[PDB]
Design a binder for this molecule. Structure first.
Ligand SMILES: *[C@@H]1O[C@H](CO)[C@@H](O[C@@H]2O[C@H](CO)[C@@H](O[C@@H]3O[C@H](CO[C@H]4O[C@H](CO)[C@@H](O)[C@H](O)[C@@H]4O[C@@H]4O[C@H](CO)[C@@H](O)[C@H](O)[C@H]4NC(C)=O)[C@@H](O)[C@H](O)[C@@H]3O)[C@H](O)[C@H]2NC(C)=O)[C@H](O[C@H]2O[C@@H](C)[C@@H](O)[C@@H](O)[C@@H]2O)[C@H]1NC(C)=O
Ligand SMILES: *[C@@H]1O[C@H](CO)[C@@H](O[C@@H]2O[C@H](CO)[C@@H](O[C@@H]3O[C@H](CO)[C@@H](O)[C@H](O)[C@@H]3O[C@@H]3OC[C@@H](O)[C@H](O)[C@H]3O)[C@H](O)[C@H]2NC(C)=O)[C@H](O[C@H]2O[C@@H](C)[C@@H](O)[C@@H](O)[C@@H]2O)[C@H]1NC(C)=O
Ligand SMILES: *[C@@H]1O[C@H](CO)[C@@H](O[C@@H]2O[C@H](CO)[C@@H](O[C@@H]3O[C@H](CO)[C@@H](O)[C@H](O)[C@@H]3O)[C@H](O)[C@H]2NC(C)=O)[C@H](O)[C@H]1NC(C)=O
Ligand SMILES: OC[C@H]1O[C@@H](O)[C@H](O)[C@@H](O)[C@@H]1O
Ligand SMILES: OC[C@H]1O[C@@H](O)[C@H](O)C[C@@H]1O
Length: 602
C-alpha cells in the first residue's frame, strides 16, 4: 500500500510517526548509533541499521583528498544505509568549526576568539553560509558547530573555541546557526529544528552546558557554580540557539557541581527538552558516555543506562558500536530503559532528518564540489581575519610617530619570527589534523607571502626566521614585521597554567626590535603573558588564530583598512590573577575587555 513516510509532500511530524511505527528495536537503536568512518563498512551500516557517521579530527579518506573523493566516500556509506529494509538515510557529521577544516584546500576562517573580537554577528552569519557550502562540497550534511562555550579562564585548551568570556558576545554570535542552516520562517516555534535544504547543513550548539566554566580551565573538569551563575553565564546562548532553530545539541564532557553532564537528567531532560522545548536531537560527545565513570569505560553498561535515561538521543560511540548496540538492546529487553525513551530519541533523530530534506536528497551534489576553497569564501575569511585583529600598542611613547600603518614602498624590509611563514601555526588546532600541525598543510597565504603580495615592487623583502641582533642592525631595514606565538593545540593538549609563548619568540622580538622599528604580530588562541613583548615592540597586534588568509593581517598593517577589533576577553597582568573576568570585584586587567587601538585607512 501507500507508505506515508516516503511521501515528500507530507508534514514532517506525520512522516516521523509513520516511519517510527514501522521500526524494529534493532532499527530504532541503530538510528541512535553514530560511528566513525574508520569502523564503517557497507555490511556494518546495513546489518546494524546505523543512523549516523562522523569524521573525528583528522579522519579523512586520504591526505589531500579532493571534494569529489569526500563525496564518493559519503555516498558509498549512504548507499549501504539506503539499502536497508526501511532505507533510512544516514547523516554524516564533522567538526567544521572554522571552515570545513579537516579538508585539504578548504577555506580556513579565524577561530572563534578572533570572531568575538570583530563584534560583527553578520560577518559570522556569512561565515556560517560559506562554511555550509564548503561542507556540502564534500557531501557532508552536519557540522558540529557552533561552540557556544563562555570561556571564563584562558588556561583552558579550548578558550580559542569560545567567542568571549562575555555571554552577551557569545549570544550575538549565535548568528552562525542561521548561516549554517538557513534563516527560520516567520512562523517559527523556538526549539524546533530547522535546515533550509540541500545547500545548508544541520548545526550543533555545544557543549551543553558550562564547558567554559571548569576549575582552573581544566578541560572536561568540574564547573563549580550555583544555578543562578549557570543560568546567567553559561546557559543564555542556548536559548538564542533554540530561537534560531539549532538542529542538534552536543553534551559536554564537563560536570556541574560534580554531576557529569552526560548523566544529568535534570539539565538534559528537565531543562533543555522540557523547559527550553528543544525538539531536535541531543548527541553525546566522543566517548562522552564512557567518561561518566572513573576510569573511563570501566562500567559501560552503567554509561549506557545513565546517558540514555538522562535524555541523550544519539551516541557518538564512535568505535565500539557492537558493545553499545548489544548493551542498549539488553537494557530495553530487560525493561531498564522504557520503549518511550527509545521512541523519543528516534522521533527527534528522524525529525531532524526529515526536516532537513535528507530523505529527498540523501546523496552528494557533484556540482557543489567547486564550493571548496572558493575565492569568494577566501575573500570573506580575509575580511574576518582583518576585522579580528586587536591593536594593543602603536608607538612606545605619546611623542612617537605611530608605526602603523606601514608604508608599502620602502627600500628594504624584514619579515621575521617562527610564525611569519607557517600556515599551520596561523591556523592553529582543528586544521587538517585534530591538533593542527606545522608548515604548509593546506592552501593559504602566510604572513610573509601576504607581505610580498602587498608591498611596492621596489620594496626588497628579506625573510629570516630567527635573526640575531647584528643581522638586523647591519641589514639596512626600514622596519620589521615579526610574528611569534603559540603552537597549534586542541582540547586537553592546550590546557596551560603558565600561558607563556614558546621560545624562540620573545628573544626574536627583542633582537629584531632592538635593531629596527618593529611591528609584532602575536598569534595565539588566547591572552598570553605579553608585557615583555610589549616592552620590546613599537607596535603589537593580537591576531589570534587568523586562518588560511594571511592577507587579512597585511590589509591592516599597510593601512588598506583601519584596525577595528576589540578584545573579546580580559588581558590579565599575571596568571596568578586567574580567573579574572569583566565585572569581577577584584578586576585588575593589563587590558580590559573591549580595549583596542584604532588606525585609519591610508
Ligand atoms: C607552559 O605549559 C605548557 C603546557 O603544559 C608547556 O608547553 C608544553 O610543553 C610540554 C613539555 O615540554 C610539551 O610536551 C612535549 O612535546 C614534545 C614535542 O613538542 C613539540 O611539538 C608539539 C606538537 O607535536 C608542539 O605542541 C610543541 O610546542 C613542540 O613544538 C616545537 O617547539 C619548538 C620550540 O618552540 C619549535 O622549535 C619546534 O618547531 C616545534 N615543533 C612543532 C612540530 O611545532 C614531545 O616530543 C614530548 O614527548 C612532550 O609531549 C608540549 O608539546 C607543550 N605544549 C604546547 C606547546 O602546546 C610549556 O612548556 C614548554 O614549551 C615547549 C614548547 C618547550 O619549549 C618546553 O621546553 C617548555 O618547557 C610551559 N611553559 C613553561 C613551563 O615555561
Ligand atoms: C578612523 O577610525 C575611526 C576608529 O575606528 C573611525 O571611527 C569609527 O567608525 C566606526 C564605523 O563607522 C564606528 O562604529 C560604529 O559605531 C556605532 C555607534 O555605536 C554603531 O552603531 C555602528 O554599528 C558601528 O559600530 C561598529 O559596528 C561593526 C562592529 O564590528 C564594530 O565593532 C562596531 O564598532 C565607531 O563608533 C567610530 N569610532 C569613533 C571613536 O568615532 C572613523 O570612521 C569615521 O567615518 C565616518 C564616515 C563615520 O562612520 C564616523 O563614525 C567616523 O568618524 C575613521 N575615520 C575615517 C575618516 O575613516
Ligand atoms: C578534574 O581534574 C582532576 C585532575 O586531573 C581529576 O582528579 C584526578 O583524577 C584521577 C582519576 O581520574 C586521579 O588519578 C588516579 O590516581 C590514583 C593514585 O592516587 C591511581 O590509583 C589511579 O590509577 C589514577 O591515576 C588523580 O589522582 C586525580 N588528581 C587530583 C589532583 O585529584 C578530577 O577527577 C577531575 N574532575 C572531574 C569532575 O572531571
Ligand atoms: O570530533 C567530535 C568531537 O570530539 C570531541 O572530543 C570534541 O569535544 C567535540 O567538540 C567534537 O565535536
Ligand atoms: O575530539 C577528540 C578527537 O579525537 C581524535 O583522536 C579523533 O580523530 C576524533 C575526535 O575529533
Amino acid at each position: 500500500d501507500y507508505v506515508l513516510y516516503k511521501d515528500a509532500t507530507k508534514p514532517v511530524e506525520d512522516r516521523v510517526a509513520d516511519l517510527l511505527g514501522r521500526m524494529t528495536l534493532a532499527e530504532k537503536i541503530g538510528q541512535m548509533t553514530q560511528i566513525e568512518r574508520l569502523v564503517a563498512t557497507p555490511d556494518v551500516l546495513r546489518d546494524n541499521f546505523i543512523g549516523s557517521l562522523l569524521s573525528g579530527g583528522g579522519s579523512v579518506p586520504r591526505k589531500g583528498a579532493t571534494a569529489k573523493e569526500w563525496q564518493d566516500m559519503v555516498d558509498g556509506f549512504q548507499k549501504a544505509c539506503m539499502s536497508t529494509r526501511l532505507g533510512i538515510p544516514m547523516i554524516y557529521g564533522i567538526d567544521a568549526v572554522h571552515g570545513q577544516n579537516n579538508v585539504y584546500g578548504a577555506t580556513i576562517f579565524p577561530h572563534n576568539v578572533g570572531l568575538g573580537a570583530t563584534r560583527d554577528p553578520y560577518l559570522v552569519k556569512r561565515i556560517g553560509e560559506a562554511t555550509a557550502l564548503e561542507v556540502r562540497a564534500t557531501g557532508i550534511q552536519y557540522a558540529f558547530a557552533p561552540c557556544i562555550a563562555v570561556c571564563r579562564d584562558p588556561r583552558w585548551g579550548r578558550c580559542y573555541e569560545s567567542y568571549s568570556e562575555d555571554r552577551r558576545i557569545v549570544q550575538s554570535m549565535t548568528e552562525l546557526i542561521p548561516g549554517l542552516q538557513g534563516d527560520v520562517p516567520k512562523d517559527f516555534t523556538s526549539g524546533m529544528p530547522f535546515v533550509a535544504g540541500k545547500n545548508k547543513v544541520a548545526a550543533c550548539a555545544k557543549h551543553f552546558v558550562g564547558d567554559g566554566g571548569t576549575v582552573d580551565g581544566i578541560n572536561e573538569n568540574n564547573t563549580i557554580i550555583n544555578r543562578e551563575g549557570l543560568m546567567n553565564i553559561h546557559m543564555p546562548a542556548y536559548k538564542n540557539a533554540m530561537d534560531k532553530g539549532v538542529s542538534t545539541v552536543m553534551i559536554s564532557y564537563s560536570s556541574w557541581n560534580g554531576v557529569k553532564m552526560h548523566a544529568n537528567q535534570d539539565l538534559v531532560t528537565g531543562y533543555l527538552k522540557d523547559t527550553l522545548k528543544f525538539k531536535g536531537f541531543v548527541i553525546s560527545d566522543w566517548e562522552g558516555i564512557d567518561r561518566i565513570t572513573t576510569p573511563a569505560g570501566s562500567d559501560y553498561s552503567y554509561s549506557v543506562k545513565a546517558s540514555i535515561l538522562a535524555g541523550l538521543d544519539m551516541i557518538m560511540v564512535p568505535n565500539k558500536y557492537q558493545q553499545f548496540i548489544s548493551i542498549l538492546t539488553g537494557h530495553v529487553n530487560g525493561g531498564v530503559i522504557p520503549m518511550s525513551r527509545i521512541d523519543d530519541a528516534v522521533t527527534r533523530i528522524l525529525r531532524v532528518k526529515f526536516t532537513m530534506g535528507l530523505f529527498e536528497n540523501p546523496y552528494a551534489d557533484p556540482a557543489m564540489a567547486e564550493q571548496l576553497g572558493k575565492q569568494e569564501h577566501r575573500d570573506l575569511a580575509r575580511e574576518a581575519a582583518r576585522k579580528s585583529l586587536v591593536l594593543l600598542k602603536n608607538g612606545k611613547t605619546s611623542t612617537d610617530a605611530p608605526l602603523l600603518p606601514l608604508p608599502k614602498k620602502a627600500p628594504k624590509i624584514l619579515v621575521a619570527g617562527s610564525h611569519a611563514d607557517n600556515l599551520g601555526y596561523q591556523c592553529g588546532g582543528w586544521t587538517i589534523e585534530w591538533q593542527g600541525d606545522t608548515g604548509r598543510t593546506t592552501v593559504g597565504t602566510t604572513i610573509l607571502e601576504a607581505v610580498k603580495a602587498a608591498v611596492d615592487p621596489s620594496t626588497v623583502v628579506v625573510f629570516a626566521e630567527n635573526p640575531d641582533a647584528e643581522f638586523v642592525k647591519s641589514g639596512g631595514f626600514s622596519y620589521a614585521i615579526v610574528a611569534v606565538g603559540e603552537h597549534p593545540y586542541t582540547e586537553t593538549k592546550g590546557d596551560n597554567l603558565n600561558l607563556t609563548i614558546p621560545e624562540p619568540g620573545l628573544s626574536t622580538v627583542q633582537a629584531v626590535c632592538g635593531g629596527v622599528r618593529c611591528a609584532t604580530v602575536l598569534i595565539s588562541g588566547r591572552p598570553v603573558v605579553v608585557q615583555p613583548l610589549l616592552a620590546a615592540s613599537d607596535a603589537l597586534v593580537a591576531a589570534w588564530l587568523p586562518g588560511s588568509e594571511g592577507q587579512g593581517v597585511t590589509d591592516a598593517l599597510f593601512g588598506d583598512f583601519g584596525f577595528t577589533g576589540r578584545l573579546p576577553r580580559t588581558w590579565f597582568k599575571s596568571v596568578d590573577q586567574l580567573p579574572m573576568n569583566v565585572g569581577d570585584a577584584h578586576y585588575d586587567p593589563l587590558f580590559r575587555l573591549g580595549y583596542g587601538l584604532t588606525t585609519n585607512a591610508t
